[PDB]
Structure 1
Amino acid sequence: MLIPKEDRKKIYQHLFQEGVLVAKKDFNQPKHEEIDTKNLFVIKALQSLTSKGFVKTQFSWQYYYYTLTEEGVVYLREYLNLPEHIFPATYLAGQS
């Protein structure tokens, strides 16, 4: 919960770049893959997001899978401050 804001911002940015965040169930872990933060910081943030809509979470084998809803996307837009016609994977990352 006691999260330095820069880290949070970074996490948000990462999410917007992707739309998907996969994180190990590892509190007491120094660094997360891709993001320059502790795993715990990520995981708790995602939990918080979930708790008021925003993010959908899945568990499978000690390894959290986080996806986003449209409300979540909106929230991200509001907070991170990205305009419109931008990345995610929710409204097509490209064409697959």
Structure 2
Amino acid sequence: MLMPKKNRIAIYELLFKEGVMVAKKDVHMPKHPELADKNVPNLHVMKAMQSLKSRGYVKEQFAWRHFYWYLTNEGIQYLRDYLHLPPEIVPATLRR
């Protein structure tokens, strides 16, 4: 499949900012629900998150519709590696 670059760096810059996110079980949808900025899709976000499932960087939760993902430290080091910023910044889940 084709993965456009802007949406994927968008989901890094949202996933590093807010660590946990939900996604309703919908492939046939024109617009991703809680990201109302651009015409971002949902199936590409699903495929990226199951890629981090296949590497094991993020855990999985699923109840009826809303796929819940939980990142581990491997996802943290992958995010801070592809972000190319020094690690003096922290994700907001660590912030109290």
TM-score (norm 2): 0.86
Residue 21 of structure 1 corresponds to 21
Residues 1-96 of structure 1 aligned to structure 2 (within 5 Å): 1-32=1-32, 33-34=34-35, 36=38, 37-90=40-93, 92=94, 94-95=95-96
Amino acid at match of 1:60: A
Contact 1:46/1:55, CA 8 A, preserved across alignment? yes
TM-score, normalized by length of structure 1? 0.86
Return the alpha-carbon distance in structure 1 between the equivalents of residues 7 and 46 of structure 2. 12
Residue 82 of structure 1 and its aligned partner are, at CA, apart by 2.7
Aligned partner of 2:26: which letter? D
User: Could you say what secondary structure the match of 1:41 adopts?
Assistant: helix
Q: Retained in 2: the 8 A contact 1:31–1:39?
A: yes
Once the two structures are TM-superposed, the CA of residue 41 in structure 1 deviates from its matched residue by 1.2
More helix by share: 1
Which runs of structure 1 show a deviation greater than 2 angstroms over 4 or more consecutive aligned residues? none
8 Å CA contact 1:23, 1:65 repeated in 2: yes
- Same amino acid, percent of matched pairs: 57
- Residues 16 and 88, structure 1, Cα contact 8 Å, conserved in 2: yes
- CA displacement at 1:73 relative to structure 2: 0.6
Q: 1:18 aligns to what SS in structure 2?
A: coil
Structure 2: unaligned runs, 5 residues or longer: none
CA RMSD of aligned residues (A): 1.5
